[model samples]
Structure formats: structure tokens, C-alpha cells
Target: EFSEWFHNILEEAEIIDQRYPVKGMHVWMPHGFMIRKNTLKILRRILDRDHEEVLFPLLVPEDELAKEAIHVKGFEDEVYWVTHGGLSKLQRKLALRPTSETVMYPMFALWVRSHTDLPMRFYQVVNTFRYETKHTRPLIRVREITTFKEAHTIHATASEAEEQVERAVEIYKEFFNSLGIPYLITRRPPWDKFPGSEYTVAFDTLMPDGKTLQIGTVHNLGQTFARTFEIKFETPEGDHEYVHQTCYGLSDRVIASVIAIHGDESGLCLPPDVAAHQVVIVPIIFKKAAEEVMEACRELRSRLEAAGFRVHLDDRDIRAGRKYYEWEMRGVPLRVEIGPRDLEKGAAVISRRDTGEKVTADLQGIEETLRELMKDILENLRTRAWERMESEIREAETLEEASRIVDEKRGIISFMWCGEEECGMDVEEKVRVDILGIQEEGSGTCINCGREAPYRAYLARTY
Candidate 1:
């Protein structure tokens, strides 16, 4: 049901087109592009607080990509290689970056020289290519990820790099919260961590279909990448040392989570922060008083726009019922309908997308009223989503119970883990669910091995 609903909503709501003549690629519709633009606007504002924006070339030389064996090995199967030029075979192969570590680390080696530049933070929102072998979904499992926001930081010491990892997690938490998306944060196991990295922290949000979707990840690189690329900084004591680095990223899956989490059978229920038009004004008209209603609607739109709200006046030559249906499908947060009778009363009816509740508000100072309503809508969305996710998290004491929960309830299951890779893999094999990661330190025995556990972990069927 969720799959069908998601597929239909993407087309009906004008978000994306999957008929782009590619297996793992899609075209972003104008409406979808605006949603993405506003989403990134929020991310840029948060990252801009401490990180400077930067861009690097798309093509990574084969040699450069192969410099870090572990990192390259992780992506080697998925990398798209360009072996020929316009008409002939090239001297060196080029790789469309699966991720930008190999492409940017080479430049980072050139940019760092002294202790003053020890703490450099830079981010870029760019496209990354991966030849995904799994079944492809439009925004979820795509070869060309068009909305990759990656932030890379260089630090002078391990503690600073660890701090940066935490900082990145906080930045992402703020970003996801603004969109009314609920998440679970966990420390990934060593065997499943990012290639050539010490450890990884990830944010996973449950989708409507009861599977977890990883929305973001932050990795502490320690000195692996710096040592691999020779990114050494001159210390104040006149010695050279490899820089400690961190990288975190969010991709199109984030937008997917926002849609999959808040959308309903009627249509999308977009948060105000990312909605293209927060408010849609519809003039209920009769033949004789159509002009009066139109005039009133225009005035209301002007006032809301003046108040800095994204407002749209639907003056299309269509039935009012049809207009309401379309705008509801588009996920406009609020809809204000004014007819001849309401205009005479100097009032309008406002409808909420999240809840189909309507209320009458006087036209005078309607902007302030709508502002409060919008705030309430966001809060309601946030609270409802968090409640749903929290209620779905079931705790289990044994592998059998955990597997049953996964099969029947289909959400995250928490249990004690022994922090052993062999025991963790055994749990996954027996239960048929991936270990999401450790949530906190544990005092009980491991659910699978019955060993003295030191960590509380999560397992879920993932997307």
C-alpha cells in the first residue's frame, strides 16, 4: 500500500518523473525542484554557520581513486568508469565519483600547509554517480544522486575530529527536525562502518511501510584519509602531522523520507519550511459576485506576501472543488477560501492540509493568525511523527522475539548486543534483519550469544 501510494503521489503531486530512459535515474519536475531548493536552503543556512561552501570537479582519476585501497574497494563495484575520450582511448581512466573523498582529498593535500589551517570545514551540494545494482526507486535507490550534501572537516587532533563528528550529527538533527522528520541515531558497528574510517554515526527514520531509511551519516576518518593523501599540516613546534578528518552526507533519500513519512492517501502533507507555497488562496465565486470575491482574495494574498509568507492565489478557470483537490494533493499547508457571503462578513475559511480542519478568521490582521496556524501545523506534524516512531520501537530480549516483531510489526527492535562482530552477524543471519547499530551502553546479556553485553543495539528491515 505504501509503495503504491508513494509512486502515485510522486506523479500526482508533480514531484518527479521516473520515465527518464534510465534504470536508476529520474527527472525532477519543477514543483519537485522547488521543494529540493527550499530544503537545501535550510541545510545551507545551518552549515553556513560554521562551514564554508566549496565545489570540486566531478571526474576522479583512476589513480587518485585507487590511492586509498579500502575506500576504493568499497566503491569499486559501483564506480562508473570512462575509458575513452571523444574518439580514442584515453591515457588514464576517469571515474564519475561515487563519493567525493578521492576527488577532494587530493586537493585538500594541496590546500593545507600550516597549523593555522588545521580546522578547515567545507561543504558541497553536488551530484554523485553510483551504478546501483539493486532495484531502483526514484529518489531512494538511484544511480545519479542529485541532492548529495557532503561536509568534510579537517582537524588537528583526534578529539577535535570526534567533536566535529558530533557537531555534524547535531547539524543534521536540526535540519531533520525542521522538516518534522523523526529519526534514530546510532553508532554503526566496526564491520559496517565507512571504508577507511574509525566509526560511523547514522540517522535512520522509519517509513510508512515499516522499514527504516537511512537519511544521513557522519564518519570520523581518524588519520586514514589524511595519511593516504599525505595531508600533513605544519605544527607550531615545527613538526608535520597528518590531519584528522570527518565527513558527513545527506542525499535524495532525505526528501524521500519527508514525503514517505508525512504523506497520506489524499496526498503529500509537506512541512511549511519546505513547501513551495505555504498558503493557497481560493476564491469561492458566484456568477454575480465573482469579481468581488476575486478582489478580496487578491488583497488577502498581497497582505500575506507582505508578511513574508509564500502565498498563491488560485485564479484558474476551473471549478473551486477541483482547485481545492489539486492544491490538497500539492501539500499546501493552508488554504483560505473566501466567497461573496464570507467577503461581506470580512472573513475567510482556512483549511489545514495535515488535518482537514477548517476555521473562520476575520480578514483583518489575517497574516498574524495564519502565522500562528502555520506554526501549529508544523508542531502538530512533528509531534505526530515522533509519537508514531516512538510507539513502533519494540524492545526484545531474544532473537525469536525480535524476528517476530520484525515480521509482524515491521519497525525498529532494540536488544542488548555483546559488541562482538561474530555474534552480531549471527543475529542478523538468524533473524533476517540488519543491525542498525548501537544506541547506548547495555548492562544485560546479549540477545543472541548470552554474553555479558556492553551495548544496546537496534535491528530493522531497511530500505
Candidate 2:
């Protein structure tokens, strides 16, 4: 059910065009692009408050990319290479960025010279290229991510970098909440953490298909990239030291999560904050009074627009039912229907997309009414999604039970883990599910080895 609904909504709702010929690249339709623009606008409001946006070259020299061993090892296959410059042999091979670390840190080496520059925060929203070996889905597993927001920061000490990691997590919390999406945050296992990162924390959300999708990640570099790139700063003590670093990123996965979690059988139920049109106006015109009905619709549109609502007037010659179907599928949060009879009665028919509720109310303060209705719709979608995720979580006492739940229910299974590499591996090897890091209250003896477990761990199928 989820697979069908997700795929069809992307096409029918005009979010993405999947027939782009490329394996993992897709085109964003204008309507869908507006949604993305507004979503990123929310994200930027948080980042631009403190961080300065910057741009970096997409190509990394082979020598610079090879400087970090673990990082190169992690992305060797995925990185695309450009060996020739317009058919002529180049002196050094250039690599298309799988991520910006290899490209940005080199410039940071030159940018920092003293203690005053110790804490620098920079971010960029750009596309990064990757060669995917697994099956490629449109937004979930794209080769060319059209909307990647990455923030990289450098601090004077390891403690400061760690503190920045927490702040970055909070920023992400506020960001997702604005999008009306709920998530679970956890620390990643040592083996599964980001390449060359001292540690990694992640945010994941449950999808309707009973799989968890990682929507965001924060990494504490702890001078790993600093040492590799020779990014040193003079301290107040006149001593040279490497700068500690933290990086966090969110891609189109944030958009995907909102789409999947909120959409229903009929169509997308987008949050008003990011919906292209918060309200759609449909005028029911008859042959006798077509001019009067159309005029009424235009005046209503002007009033709502002045009141700061993204309103659309469906003055098409098509039937009102057809317009309603199209706008509903496109996820317009509110709809107003007006006919000659209602106008005479000094009232208009209002319809809500989130719930199929309709009412006839006089035009006075209609904008205020729609504003409150949209607020309620956003909260309702959020509550329903949170409830679905809560209902899908199952607790297990042993590895066997966890596997049983994974195979049968296909939801997340929480169990006590010993925090030992061996015990974590056994769960993965036997259950064929990922260890979704340690839970907040994970403690006691490990479920697999019966040893003292430092924390709780989660097991689930992932996207």
C-alpha cells in the first residue's frame, strides 16, 4: 500500500518526474519545486541566523581526495572521476564530490590563521554526485540530490566541537518540527558512523512501509579532517593546534519523509507552511450568472492574498468537481466553493482538505477562519504520523524475539545490547537488520551475550 501510494503521488501530484532517462536522477516539477523552496526557506531561517552560506568547487583533485585514508576508503567506489579535460589528459585526476569534506577542508587550511578564526560556521545548499551500486529510488536513493543542505563548523577544542554537535541537533529538531515531521534521534555504532568521523548522531523517521529512513546526520570530526588538511590555528597562548570540526547534513530525504508520512490514500496532505497554495478557490458558475460568480471568486482571491494566504482561483472552464479533484491531489490545504445561491445568501462554502469537512459561512473574517483551520490541519497530520510510528514500535527481550518481530511485523524492535562489537554483530548477522544505534534509555545487560549492557539498541530494516 505504501509503495503504490508513494510512487503514484510523486507523479500524480507533480512533485518529481521520474522518466528522466538517468538511473537515479529525476526532474523537479514547478509545483514540487515550490514546495522544496519553501521547505528550504524554513531550514535557511535557522542556519542563516548564525552561519554564513558559502560555495565550493564540485571537483576535488585526486591528491587532495587521497589525503584522508579512511574517508577515501569509504567513498572510493561511489566517487565519480573526471580524468580528461575536454579530451586532453589532465595532470591530476579530478573527483566529483561525493560529499564536500574533501573539497572544503583544503580551503579551510588557508582561511584560518589565528585564534580569532577558531570558531567558523559555513553552509551550502548544492547538488553532490554519487555512483550508487544499490537499487536507486527517486528521492530516497538519488545519484544527484537536488537539495542537499550541509553545514560544516570548526571549533577551538574537542569539547567545543561536541557542544556544536548538540546545537546542530537542536537546530535540526526545530527544522523538522516546522515541517510537521516527527523523528527519533540516536548515536550511531562505531563501525557504522560516518567515514573518518570520531562519532555520528542521526535522526530517523518511520515510513508507512514499516522501514526507518535516516533523514539527517551530525558528525563530530574531532580534528580528523583538520590534521589531514593541515588546518591549524594559533592559540591565545601562541601555540599552534588543529581545529576540531563538526558537520551535519540533510538532503531530499527530509522532503521524502514529509511526503510519505503525511500523504493518505487519496493524495498528499502537505503542511500549510510548505504547501504551494494554502487555499484553492473554486467558483461554481451557471450560464445565467457566470460573470457574477467569476467576479466574486476574483474578489475573494484578492482579499485572501492581501491577508497573506497563498490562494489559487480555479476559474477554468472545467467542472468544479474536476478542479476539486486536481487541487486535492496536489495537497492544497483548504478549498472554498462559491455558487450564485450562496453569494445571494451572503455566505460561501468552505471545505478542508485535511478532513473532508465542509461548511457554509459568511465571507466576514473568512481569512482568519482558514488560518486557524490550516493550523489545526498541520497539527492533525503530525499527531497521526506520530501515533503511527508509536504503534509500530515493538520491544523484545532476546535476539530471537527481535528477529521474529522484524520478519512478521516489519517494524522497529528495541532490545538491550551489551555495547560490545561482538554482540552487536551477532544481532546484525543473525537478524539481517541494522543496529539503529543506542536508545536514550538503553541500559542493563546485553540481550545477546547476557553481559552488562551500557545502553539500549534498536533493530530495524532501513531505506
Candidate 3:
């Protein structure tokens, strides 16, 4: 039901058009682009505090990509190669980057020559291509990830690199908080960590369908990439040492989580932080007092605009109910309705998208009222999403209990693990779900092996 509703909402809400000629690529409509823009604005604001924005080429040389053997091996099957130029065979094939690690590290090698260049934090927002062989879903899984925000940082020491990874995780937490998206942060298992990285920490959020979606990841690269790319920096003592590296990223799935997590059957329920139009004013029109209502709505819009609100006045020639339906479908955070009666009463009816509650507010202080309401709406969304996800996280004592939860409830199951790859894989095989990795360290009996356990892990059906 959520799958069907998601498809319909994407279409009816004018978010993305999946009708493009490409199989796993879709076009973002104007409405969706605005949401994307506003969403990325929050991310950029957070990352701009310390990271410098940079852009790299879309195509990476085959030799450069192969330099990082483990990273290249991980993406070898999914890489899209550019083999020809205007019908002429090229001497070497170019790979459309599945990720920017290989493409950016070589430049890091060239740029870092001294201790002054030791701590370089750079980021880029670009499209990445992968020849996805599995099923494709808009935003969630696709051939071309259109909104990939990847940040790569180099530090002089391993400790600084580890700190950078934690900093990146905090940055992502703030970014997701602004969007009111709730997540579970975990240390990915050794086998599941990012290729060529010492360890990986991931943020997974539960969708309405009970499937967990990986929304962000931070990797502590140690000296792997620096060693592979020869990114060495001169120390204060004049000796050269490989720079420690870390990279973290958020993809289009962040937007998908915003859409899937908060939306309802009524339509998309966008948080005000990312809503294209935070407040949509609908002038309820009657032939007699239509001009009066329009004038009032325009005045209200101008007042709100002056106070820096994204306001849209819906003055279309359609019925008032239809206009309300349209804006609601588009997930406008708040709606202000002004009709002849409302004008006479010197107030307009305000409606909240998160909760379909309506109230009448004096026109004199409507701006302040809407401001409070928008804040309340964002808080409400954050609280509600976190509460729902918290409720869905179940605890299991044995593999059978975990398997039952996987089949019956379909949510994240917390269990003790003996910290062995063999035991973890066995539990996953029996439960028919992936181990989302360790949540924290704890003492208990392993759910699978029944041995003394040292770690608490999360298991979930994933996207």
C-alpha cells in the first residue's frame, strides 16, 4: 500500500517524472526542484561551516579508479564505462564515477605538499552513475543519483581523521534534524563497511513500510586512500607521512525519507524547512466579494514576504476546495484561507498540513501566529517521526524471535551478538534480514550462537 501510495503521491504532487527514456533515471519537476533546492540549502549551510565547496569531473580515468584496488573492485560491476568519443574508439576507457573517492583523492595528492595543507575539507554536490542491476525506485534506488553531497577530508594524523568522522556524523544529524527526519546511527559490520575504509558509520531511517533506508554514511579511511593515491604531506619536522582521510555523504534518499516518512494518505506532508512554499494563501472566491478576498490575501502575502516567508497566493479560477486539495497535495506547510466572511471577521482561517487542524487568527498579528505555527509544525513532525521509529524498534532474545519480528512486524530488531562474522551471518540467514550492524556494546547471550555476547546489533529488512 505504501509503495502504491508513494508512486501516486510523486505523480500527483508533481515531484518527479519517471517517464524519461532512461530506466533508473527520472526528471525532477519544478516543484520537486524547489524542495530539493531548499533541502540542500540546509545541508550546505551545515557543511559550509568547515568544508570548502569544490567540483570534480564526472568521468574518472580508468587507471586512476583502479589505483584504489578495493574501492574499484567494490564498484567494478556497477561502473558505467565511456568507451567511445563520436564513434571513434578511445585508447582508454573512462568510468563514470560511482562515487568521487577515486576522482578526488588524486587531486588531494597534488594539492597537499606541506603541513599547512594537512587538514583539507572539501565537498561537492554532483550526480553519480551506477549501473544498478536490482530493482529501481525513484530517489531511493536509481542509476543516476542526482543529489549526491560527498565531503572528503584529509588530516595530518589518524586521530584527526577519526574526529572528522565523528564531526561528519554530527553534521548529518543536524542536517537531518532540520528536515525532521529520524535515524538510527550504527557502526557497520566489518564485512559491510565501505570498501578500503577502516570503518563505516551509517544512518538508517525507517520508512512507513517498515523497511530501513540508508540515508547517510561516514567512513574513516585511515591511510588507505592516501597510501593508494600517494597523498603525502610534509610534517613540521620535515618528514613526509601519508595523510589520513575520511569521507561522508548523503544522497537523494534523504529527500525520499522526507517524502516517505512524514507523508500521509492525504498527500505529502513536507516539513516547513524544506517546503517550497511554507505558507500557501488561498483566497476563497465568491463572485460578489472575490476582489476583496484577493486584495486581503495579496496584502497578507506581501506582509509575510517582507518578514521572509515563502508564501504563495493561490488565486486560480478553480473552486476553493480544489485549490485547497492541490496545495495540500503539494505539502504546503500551512494554508491561509480568506473569503468574504473571513474579510468581514478581520481574520483568515489557517490550516496546518501536519495536522489538519484549522483556526482563525486576527489579520493584525497573522504573521506571528503563522510563525509560531510553522515552528510548532516542524517540532511536531520531528517528534512524531522519532516516536514512530522508536516504537518500531523491537528487541529480540533469540533468532526465532528475531525471524518472527522480521516476518510479522518488519522493523528493526535489536539483539545481542557474539561479535563473530560467522554468528552474524548465520542469524541473518535464518532471520532473512541483513544485520544493520552494531548499535552499541553490551553484555548478553548471543541470540544465534547462545554464547557470551559483547555487542548489541540491529537487524532489519533494508532498502
Candidate 4:
């Protein structure tokens, strides 16, 4: 019953087509793409401040990918290899990049040769490929990951690199914060980190069913790659030294969560921050209602837009219920319905996507009325999600207890950890709750080793 809304939203709302011939690859409907673009714009607003934009090639040389041990170890299983060129065996094999790591590292070596390039920050929005062994879902998981935004920076020192990791994490927090998604942050265990990274810090949005989805990740690479790739610079002190690096990546999954977390049985619910259409104006028209109702609705939409709100004026010749279902499925944050009765009384009705609340507004002050309503909607949504997240995270002491939580998915189990690899493995092997990562400092005993827990982690089946 709970997940039916998710399935229905994608199917009926025209967000995606799950009937692809292949197992995991699905086609995204146009509305889904619009949501992606709108969300990316929000991310860009946050990242553009301290990062420069750059593009790297889509293909990675097999030899170069093999150069970095950790990078190769991490992506080898999933990377799609391009072995033959034009039906002829190529001398050197190439791989459609699962990531741009290796392809760009060589260029990093070439472009960054002096201390002046220290703390060099750059980012790119591009597509990446991974041959998935697991079932893929549209936007959430896919073979051709149509949109991947990554920001990679080269710092002069290890401390600077670590700072970049935190800074990136902060920016992601701000971006998601604006989107009204509640998230939990933790450190990734070795088995779960970016292949070549020193370690990773990630954030997950706990869905309605209590499953945590990894929507964002920040990686601290340390100096491991600098030595292997020879990405060194002549320091200002006149000595040769390797560069420190950090990389952060966010994919289309964020959009999936945004849709999943707020969607209801009627359709998808979007937040105003990134909603493709922040306000949808629907005219309730009948033989008598058509003229006045639609005129008032159009005027209201214009006033809202004039006051700096993204609005959609729905004048399509369709049933009113059908229009509601369609816009709701598209996840418009708020719906403004103006009908003859309301038009006669000089007011407009507003429906909030997050809470499913509706109210009437005075048409005389529709602009000011809509602005106030959006602010109230954002605050109310954020508070409700935060409260739900707080209740869902549980503190557990034993493997049996954690396992129980995983099986029922009562909520995510957070326990103390000693950071022992063997103990973390037990959580995965016994409970089947994939280790989300370690909390920098957490509570309880090592659920595996009985050592005092120093970190926290969430376990869940991911997208």
C-alpha cells in the first residue's frame, strides 16, 4: 500500500517507462528530464561559487585505468569496456568510463604543475556508464547514467584536501536543505568507499518505507593518486611535491528521492525550490464557470510570475480531475485552482503538494498571498521530514537486534563501532543490511567485536 504511490507516480504520471527490452535500462519521460534540469540548476547555484567548470573525455584508456590500483579495483567490476573498434580488434583497449577519474588524472598531471594551481577547483556535468549486475530503475539506477555532476579539486596539502571534502559536504547539505529532503551523514567503511579514495562521507535520505538512499557522496582521496599519477607541482618553497585531492559526486538519484519521499497516492509532490513548475494554475471551468474562472486563474498566474514565482497556467481541454492527476504526478509544489464560485467571491484556492493541504486566497492580493504560502510550505515540509527521520533512526546493541530491525525495516539501526573490518562484515553477512558507513563518533559496542563503538552507520537496500 505504501509503495503503490511510488509505482503509480512513475507509471501514471508519465515520469518513466519501465518496459524497456533490457533488464535495468528504462526510458525517462520528458517530465522526469525537466525535473533533472531544474534540480541541476539548484546544485549549480550552490557549486558555482567556489568551483570552475571543466569537461573531460567520456572514454578512459584501459592502460591508464589500470595505473591507479584503488581506482581500478573500485570500478573494474562495473565499468563497460570498449574492446573492439569498428568490428576490428584495437591495439589498446578502451572503456566507456564508469567515472572520469583515470581519464582526467593524466590531464591533472599535465595542467597542474605549479603551486599556483593549488586548491584548483573544477567541476563538470556529464554522463557516465556502468554495466549494472543488479536491476536498474529509471533515474534511480541506469546503464547509461544520463546525468552525473562531479566536482574534483586539487589542493596543496592534505589538510586542504580534507577541508575540501567537508566544504563539498556542506554545499550538498545546503542544496538538499533547500530541496526539503531530510538526510543522515556518515563515513563509508573501506569496503564501501570510492575505489581510489582515502575514505568517503555520504548522506542518505530515509524514504517513507525506512530505506536510506545514497543521494550524495564526498570522497577524500588523500595523496594516494598523486604519487601514482605523478600529479605533482613545484611548491612555492622550491621543492617537488604531490597534490592532495578531493572529489564529490551527485547523480540523478537525488531527483528520484525528491519524487519518492513526497509523492502521494494521487501523484508526485515536488518542493518549490527545484520543482519544474512551482505553482500550477488550474481553471475550474463549466458552461457557466468557464469565462470568469479561467480569466481569474490566468490573471493569478500572471501576478505570481510577475512577483517572481515559476508558474504553469493549465488551460488544456481536459477533465478537472485529469488535470489534477497530471500536474500532481508532475510534482508541482502548489496548485492554484480558480473556479466560478471563487471568482465571484474574489479569491483563489491553493493546494500544497507536500502536506496535501488546501486553502483559499483573496484574489486582490494573490501575489503576496502566494509568496507567503510558499514560505509556510517549505518550513512546514522541512520540519515534518526532520521529525520523521529522528524517529526512524534506532540505537541497537547486538547483532540480533540490528538484524531484527533490518528484517522488519522498523527503521535504520545505528550502533557503536570500533571500526573493525571483521565486525562491519558481520553486519553485512548476518543482517544483510549493507553498511552505510561509520559515524565519525558514535555510540554502543562494536556490534561485531564488542569494542566500544566510535562510529555510526545506517544499513539498507539501496537504489
Which candidate tops lDDT?
1
Error of 3 at 231 (Å): 0.6
Over 4 Å off, model 2: 440-442
lDDT, candidate 4, at 242: 90
- State the number of backbone clashes in model 3: 0
Q: Which segments of model 1 are wrong by more than 4 Å?
A: none
In model 2, state the lDDT of residue 294: 83
TM-score of 1: 0.99
Q: Tens-digit lDDT track for model 1 on 1-463?
A: 9999999999988899999877898999999998999899998999999999999999999889999878888997889999999989989999998889999998999999998987999999999999976799878989999999888999999999999998998999999999999999999999989999999999999999999999999999999999999999999999999999999999999999888889887898989889989999998876868888898899888988888999999999889999999989888999999998889999989999999999999999788889999899988999999999999899999889998899999999998989898998999999988999997774889998898988989999998
Worst 10 residues of 4 by lDDT: 438-447
TM-score of each: 0.99, 0.97, 0.98, 0.93
lDDT of 4 by residue, 214-309 (tens): 898999988888888899999878999999999999887887787876656666766676677888888888789677677777777777787888
lDDT of candidate 3 over 1-463, digit per residue (tens): 8999999999998899999997999999999999999999999999999999999999998989899778888998889999999899889999999999989888888999999877899999999998976799999999999999999999999999999998999999999999999999999999999999999999999999999999999999999999998999999899999999999999999999999999897898998979989999988876868778788889999999999999998887888899888889889999998889979989889999999999999999988999899999999999999999999999999788888888999989998888798988888887789999896675999988889888888989999
- Select the stronger candidate by lDDT from 1 and 2: 1
CA displacement after TM-score superposition, residue 180 of candidate 4 (Å)? 1.4
List per-prediction Cα lDDT, in the order shown.
Answer: 0.92, 0.90, 0.92, 0.81
Global CA lDDT computed for model 1: 0.92
